[PDB]
Amino acid sequence: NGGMSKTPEGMTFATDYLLPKSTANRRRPGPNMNMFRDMARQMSSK
Amino acid sequence: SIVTKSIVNADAEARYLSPGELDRIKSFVTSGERRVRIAETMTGARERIIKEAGNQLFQKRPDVVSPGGNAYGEEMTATCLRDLDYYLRLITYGIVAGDVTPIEEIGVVGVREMYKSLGTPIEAVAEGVRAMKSVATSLLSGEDAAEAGAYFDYLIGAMS
Amino acid sequence: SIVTKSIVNADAEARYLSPGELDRIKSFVTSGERRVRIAETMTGARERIIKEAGNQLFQKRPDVVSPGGNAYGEEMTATCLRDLDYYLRLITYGIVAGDVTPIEEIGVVGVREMYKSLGTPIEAVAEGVRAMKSVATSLLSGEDAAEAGAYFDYLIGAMS
Amino acid sequence: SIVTKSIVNADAEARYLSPGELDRIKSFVTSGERRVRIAETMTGARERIIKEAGNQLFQKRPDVVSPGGNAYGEEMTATCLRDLDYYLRLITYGIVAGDVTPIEEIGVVGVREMYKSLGTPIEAVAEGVRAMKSVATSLLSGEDAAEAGAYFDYLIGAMS
Amino acid sequence: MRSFKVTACVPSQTRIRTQRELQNTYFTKLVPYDNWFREQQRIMKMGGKIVKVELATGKPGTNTGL
Amino acid sequence: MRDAVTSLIKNYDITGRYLDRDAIDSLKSYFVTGTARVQAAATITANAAELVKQAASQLFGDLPELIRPGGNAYTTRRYAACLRDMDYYLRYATYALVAGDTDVLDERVLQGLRETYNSLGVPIGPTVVGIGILKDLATEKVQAAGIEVGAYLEQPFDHLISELSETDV
Amino acid sequence: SVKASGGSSVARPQLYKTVPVSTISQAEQQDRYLGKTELSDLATYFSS
Amino acid sequence: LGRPTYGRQEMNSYFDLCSKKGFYALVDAIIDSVEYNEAFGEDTIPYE
Amino acid sequence: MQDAITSVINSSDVQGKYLDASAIQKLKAYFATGELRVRAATTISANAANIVKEAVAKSLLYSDITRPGGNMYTTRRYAACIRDLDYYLRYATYAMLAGDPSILDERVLNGLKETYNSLGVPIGATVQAIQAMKEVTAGLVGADAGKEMGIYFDYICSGLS
Amino acid sequence: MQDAITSVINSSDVQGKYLDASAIQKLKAYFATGELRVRAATTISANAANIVKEAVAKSLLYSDITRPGGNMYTTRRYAACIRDLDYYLRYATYAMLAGDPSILDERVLNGLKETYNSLGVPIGATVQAIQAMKEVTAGLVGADAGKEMGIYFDYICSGLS
Amino acid sequence: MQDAITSVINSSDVQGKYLDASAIQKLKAYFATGELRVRAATTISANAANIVKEAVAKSLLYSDITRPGGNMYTTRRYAACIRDLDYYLRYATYAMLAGDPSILDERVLNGLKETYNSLGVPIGATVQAIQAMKEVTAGLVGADAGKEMGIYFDYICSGLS
Amino acid sequence: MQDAITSVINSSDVQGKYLDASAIQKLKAYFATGELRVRAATTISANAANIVKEAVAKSLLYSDITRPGGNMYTTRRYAACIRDLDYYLRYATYAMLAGDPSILDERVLNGLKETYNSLGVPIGATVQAIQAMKEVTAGLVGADAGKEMGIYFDYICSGLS
Amino acid sequence: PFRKVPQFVTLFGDYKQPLRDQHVYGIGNDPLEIQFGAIFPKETRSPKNRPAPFGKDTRRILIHNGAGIDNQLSNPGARGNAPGSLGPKVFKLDQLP
Ligand SMILES: *[C@H](C)[C@H]1/C(=C/c2[nH]c(/C=C3N=C(/C=C4\NC(=O)C(CC)=C4C)C(C)=C\3CCC(=O)O)c(CCC(=O)O)c2C)NC(=O)[C@@H]1C
Ligand SMILES: *[C@H](C)[C@H]1/C(=C/c2[nH]c(/C=C3N=C(/C=C4\NC(=O)C(CC)=C4C)C(C)=C\3CCC(=O)O)c(CCC(=O)O)c2C)NC(=O)[C@@H]1C
Ligand SMILES: *[C@H](C)[C@H]1/C(=C/c2[nH]c(/C=C3N=C(/C=C4\NC(=O)C(CC)=C4C)C(C)=C\3CCC(=O)O)c(CCC(=O)O)c2C)NC(=O)[C@@H]1C
Ligand SMILES: *[C@H](C)[C@H]1/C(=C/c2[nH]c(/C=C3N=C(/C=C4\NC(=O)C(CC)=C4C)C(C)=C\3CCC(=O)O)c(CCC(=O)O)c2C)NC(=O)[C@@H]1C
């Protein structure tokens, strides 16, 4: 016991897990377009 | 502005400014009080101008707010309501400078390629500029709607 | 030691020991009972292991056994048999210290300058401790043989 | 040379040349006619030097002929004399320059790794230039062996 | 490849020259089809009279193949 | 670094002339405003550690993209670095206010500032708004102290705007 | 204005100090390989 | 054209033209300019 | 604009020798993966404007560079930034068919790092756009084909750094 | 090229806001001085060749420079010099009405430190011909504009040295 | 120099979200393959000089590079080429344990192309040198970790070309 | 630093051969002129402050480079330029004994086209000052050594160009 | 240690200067003016390289290879002239066989 080293090596890789995949995604603005957003929300009633 | 457009025209001919050109600056500088007074009516009431011309564009082109559109939903319409803030800022920079080069460097050169990449129809946002001409003339005077409205008719032909 | 090398880098950046770095000590105090179960095996089997691996060494390099060579006679074997006895003491000191650092303070930092003046071919004692590596790993378990072999392989690259 | 070691020691103080130090350039030129006569005589029997002095090396070092050591067959012993031909080229480079700095920047400054990483020991190459030293005196006169032998032991001092 | 053949007449219009200057006036260059609207807009700014235009090679009104 | 006096020295030194009537009246124009320069520089440093704190809270309440995880003012590693990097613009505006011209601003803060911020990803955009929120304000504590304000006390601030920000028109 | 430029090579300073960046950057500046006690961090850290 | 490029807006008008049309219209657009045709002519070898 | 095939030819040119076993061992590995390279380079050319409109959407759109003050504000640059972003997609497609990243150094990566300093456009902001462009291609041509696409994308931002 | 009208616009645009009351106040400070600048342009362009003639006779003529050995010998190197002083006069009056020396950073002072070195032009004589040109055009335009004309002459005069 | 821990968290920092289930799936493979990473790291450090000895014997010796005229002729340059060949084994093992190739972007590929084009070092002889020790390490540490070590060598060899 | 000796040796070393008859043929012309150059250096350094004094007074004194606005006006810059021109007298005597113009490339001529445009100091007056310093040192060292001295003065003037 | 041209003094002096005469996109975009070849200062071989922030519209000032007054910036109606004995030899085609 009291192993000098730890972990199960496992079967494979860690080689190509480097490239992440995600829908960032895009940029709905949300901040300083608030004044513009209010006008757009206000416009919706029509 | 007026003088730095006429300087760079007078550099390619390699000559001083003509007396037929210098009275243009002389008339513009003395008529500088009136054009600033045009510009405050644009800035001081611009929440009326965007909201009315935004309603006029979506009635003249109701295909924009449809599903499958560019300005569809609450968020994507809000920048098309904010893009008309940007073009109205260039007209009220233009009438103070009296010329077209503060408009021409900021919003005219790359605008064929810009909205091409973003997926919007270019003439539809250019149609809302034409509706923004009509509201900005309605709050303006007799002579002032013709002088300050001429740069509005520049910009519709800029994109088209 | 494992403590000292982890002190003199954290001291050199003028901080405390960060608690991601304390766990190299927190691990090894549990396995200190393992290493004293390892060091008692190699010291008692040392006087067995010295009298065949030197004889295993002399097969692949016999000209040092020959006259002209630096190990000629029984009185010219205690220059070589005690030297491998000297080196396994530093291996067992590297076992108990956790890292390789007591050999750096004792047994590596002048071997190029020592055996040049002693006339010894230095590429033999790397082969001599290569003979030490192959038979000492057989005497232990393979978990011990992987860990104790790593201190041997620094002493391979010491003279190479 | 003397002259490129004269100037680089004058840039280290940023002065002109010392007039007593200008005589060591003037002694370098007027003692140059007998120095290049040494260099062509070593060049005129450079195969007779090497094929003789290589033979007395291998009777002194039998590890590189009996199999187990470093360089063997036709495939590496011809490369072993390819090293010794380079060192003989360096000494006749050093004699016409007067100093050892053509041998310094070319052939001794990294020697303690390029054989250390390449498996062969150092001191037999230091016994090889000594084998080349004994046949370099025998081709020349008495005083010419004193000056040309002063470059051979520099090769022994940098290697071993 | 649709190579036009054009016969221009270009006056001096200032800067009179003691040179040959006959090749600059009345020339008969042949131009390809893509490089002619930039050519014909250039030849009007010198006040040149385009005299004879004949499509030397190429099918008139073809659809594919240059 | 280079005063309005010493800028007028090598405006006259390189042509090799003495101090004429134009030199004696432009330099007197600097000295009649020198009482108004120094007392404005006291009250700018009256609450200068507060003046960066009132500006940046008025900045980040105005541009809330720079707080939520976007452009770099996100952590207090960025935010307290932002208040320091704001504070250089207030502190060097005090020097050129006293020095007359902007040549202290020209070769202490402006040179390399387009190239320091591009190497970090710091935007040049709201930095212009950050000087634009101070130059209008700085004028509040000059006005509430009773010193007149206008020609200068902006001579320095928009030279940090018109030369730092890239030319559009 | 600005009349020259030194260059604008991206420089990035870490926002963090985790264990496999600090154990490596404390072993890079000593100009050596990763020693046997430095592997004992990552063999403990990855096991945990 | 026998001269260097004139500045930035004279070069930005050429860089977008080879970004869209290609190299074959870059070498066209130098030649049918006014500065090629009215400073060299239509029957001269260009010179620097 | 030499490819990977002429690179082995030019490496066997200066040595002066013929094609040995290890000289052609790096040559059959092109022909094994060559059918993947010819197929995937069509689909990037099919979506060569949907990638650029997504990569600036993933990083650059609605950010602070598109705010007034930044480089992505005036249409006149915005469109330069898009055209400069259009080269790095196309020259990555030229590089992946060649199998050689020396397409880009001879052509696009020679004077790019100092031209961007002469304009003042942020280098470190461009890298996240090319890093986002590396993501959206890898979601388009599959997992394996984005690996060799991502080598030449990472060659541009390393040369730009 | 930045006009003083456009410099307030380029300042107020990059903050994103519209025209403030303080930014409008800077243009009225320019427009009140607009009569004094456009008076100064038309009183120069009628006799811009006369100022060149009166400035070379004050400082340059009958000197070492116009003698053999000097640089204004051999009329190739004299007609080039008289148009060279015509260039600084023509570009000062553009910088007058612009109210901002940004023309001189762009179209004037680029190579003039190196092109005069690479042509063998002594800078120590053309920097005195500029100051001699300022001392005659202050007498020709007036005492009020000649200080404000003298700003954009000394921007050229400091740029040459 | 940012690692796989930093690149995941900074992918979730600027998103503002927590650790989402795709990223722990990345983080599980980083933590469970540690005893593969340690066993690979402790053996390359076990014979660091054997690997670079067999690397230059694979592809560099008896070429024209070792023959005079070549860029390894003096014993200065043979120690230099073998120090630099050791540096691509140190920094490859550094990026092995951190799991990200961004160490090589900051540390070793910053001015590598600036050095080797200033001394005239043959780059095409170096891209087979690091490719030579790709075989030697994978025969030493096994086929599993040599596949893992082969990426960082190929990331160096992509940046080299 | 390279010699005329090392320009024979290393030109025979990169071929990889020993000294031929043509290698000693350049040495014997250097050894027949080694006794002339050592007398040549000790009479230049005897009058090194006197060589500079006439050559400054010949080329550029009572000119318009020392009158204000000229680059050698202020006493920082007048004491700079004589300190600047003292290098070109000294580093030619460093290379006259060496028999080799490649002294000047490592020490003087490398960063000398720059830091002369970068301070705006005139190149054309400096080359005018070196070329008249050639004609004052011909009167001291004699006619024959000034031919070997004038080669390294023209090597300064060619690489400064 | 391979940046041979000095770094700081080429830009500490350049801050006091105006914008130096080079190509608009840096010094590495400026070929050596010889008969042929298109050699360039390669920025990666020996680091010549030095950016400069150039404007929106700039005019590089160039020297007329020939007559001094016959630059086109003074008289644009004189650029169609022959450069005469000062400039290079202009060729033209007259006689066709
Ligand atoms: C011979 C007396 C000794 C010896 C030689 C030996 N050398 C090698 C391999 C090489 N030797 C060199 C030698 C030099 N290189 C230089 O650049 C210079 C200065 C100009 C010298 C003196 C080099 C580079 C090599 C590498 C191969 C090459 O030349 O291309 C071998 C072969 C080693 C092998 O394992 O193949 C041998 C046998 N070794 C001895 O035992 C003698 C003491
Ligand atoms: C008050 C009971 C609660 C609270 C309110 C609060 N905070 C701020 C301002 C900031 N808060 C932060 C927070 C952090 N920075 C960090 O680095 C971390 C660790 C990851 C945290 C949690 C920062 C940077 C600011 C300043 C920028 C900003 O405006 O957000 C305000 C605004 C203050 C103002 O008006 O100037 C308020 C009201 N903070 C607390 O801790 C309580 C939960
Ligand atoms: C905060 C309101 C704005 C902002 C600031 C910000 N700055 C930095 C980092 C630096 N700023 C400087 C600037 C100067 N250094 C100088 O010497 C001078 C002249 C006196 C100036 C103007 C420098 C050098 C740095 C680098 C760090 C350092 O000081 O050594 C940061 C840190 C970037 C990071 O994320 O690490 C921040 C956040 N950024 C904004 O968004 C605001 C507009
Ligand atoms: C050897 C396998 C190859 C080779 C090497 C070589 N290098 C030099 C000179 C230098 N090499 C470096 C290398 C690095 N520097 C770094 O900073 C890093 C990352 C940490 C590496 C890998 C550097 C800086 C130099 C300059 C000298 C120095 O280290 O101080 C030489 C000498 C060149 C000369 O002309 O003197 C040689 C021979 N060249 C080859 O041919 C091999 C392919």
Ligand SMILES: CCC1=C(C)/C(=C/C2=NC(=C\c3[nH]c(/C=C4\NC(=O)[C@H](C)[C@H]4CC)c(C)c3CCC(=O)O)/C(CCC(=O)O)=C2C)NC1=O
């Ligand atoms: C001052 C110069 C200037 C211009 C020209 C400009 C355009 C501009 N328009 C944008 C978006 C947009 N603009 C529109 C606008 C429209 N779409 C429609 O359907 C309508 C017909 C039309 C206007 C009435 C839409 C829908 C988007 C979002 C596109 C997207 O995010 O995919 C964006 C990206 C988000 C942003 O930063 O706002 C830019 C940069 N920005 C500038 O700074």
Ligand SMILES: CCC1=C(C)/C(=C/C2=NC(=C\c3[nH]c(/C=C4\NC(=O)[C@H](C)[C@H]4CC)c(C)c3CCC(=O)O)/C(CCC(=O)O)=C2C)NC1=O
């Ligand atoms: C651990 C630190 C340490 C070192 C480095 C050490 C070296 C050491 N080697 C010695 C002798 C020697 N050691 C050797 C070595 C060898 N004989 C062979 O044939 C082989 C090639 C090789 C060993 C396997 C030789 C030949 C001598 C005698 C040298 C002579 O008599 O000239 C001696 C003198 C006698 C003695 O006290 O043993 C010392 C001190 N002692 C130490 O305590």
Ligand SMILES: CCC1=C(C)/C(=C/C2=NC(=C\c3[nH]c(/C=C4\NC(=O)[C@H](C)[C@H]4CC)c(C)c3CCC(=O)O)/C(CCC(=O)O)=C2C)NC1=O
């Ligand atoms: C070397 C062989 C050669 C010849 C001869 C030649 C003639 C020539 N004569 C021309 C014009 C002319 N030639 C005349 C002729 C005259 N004035 C009159 O009206 C009389 C009818 C006639 C009396 C001598 C006139 C008036 C023009 C100018 C036509 C115009 O531009 O309106 C022009 C066009 C303008 C020009 O480039 O000069 C050419 C090319 N070119 C050549 O290369």
Ligand SMILES: CCC1=C(C)/C(=C/C2=NC(=C\c3[nH]c(/C=C4\NC(=O)[C@H](C)[C@H]4CC)c(C)c3CCC(=O)O)/C(CCC(=O)O)=C2C)NC1=O
């Ligand atoms: C063939 C290789 C090659 C590339 C790639 C290239 C880009 C390039 N980009 C430029 C400007 C520019 N480039 C950008 C682009 C960007 N700025 C940003 O913020 C974004 C990160 C990025 C777009 C993705 C912008 C906004 C400008 C205008 C800069 C200004 O006007 O101040 C310019 C100067 C203007 C011109 O094109 O005439 C060049 C030369 N040039 C080349 O020769």
Ligand SMILES: CCC1=C(C)/C(=C/C2=NC(=C\c3[nH]c(/C=C4\NC(=O)[C@H](C)[C@H]4CC)c(C)c3CCC(=O)O)/C(CCC(=O)O)=C2C)NC1=O
């Ligand atoms: C070698 C080629 C060359 C020429 C020709 C040349 C001419 C030249 N003539 C000058 C003046 C002059 N030249 C004249 C000459 C004349 N005035 C008249 O009324 C007569 C028509 C005429 C000759 C008969 C006069 C009077 C001046 C001085 C102007 C004055 O007093 O206002 C000057 C200015 C002062 C001077 O340096 O002398 C130059 C440079 N310089 C040259 O390098």
Ligand SMILES: CCC1=C(C)/C(=C/C2=NC(=C\c3[nH]c(/C=C4\NC(=O)[C@H](C)[C@H]4CC)c(C)c3CCC(=O)O)/C(CCC(=O)O)=C2C)NC1=O
């Ligand atoms: C404002 C922008 C501007 C500058 C700076 C300018 C300088 C200028 N001066 C030139 C020639 C010259 N310029 C001078 C001028 C002078 N040398 C002297 O001795 C006098 C001190 C001084 C004038 C009085 C001379 C003598 C030459 C002829 C040098 C030669 O041709 O070799 C030339 C080359 C021929 C040409 O293309 O005109 C340029 C470009 N041109 C410009 O458009």
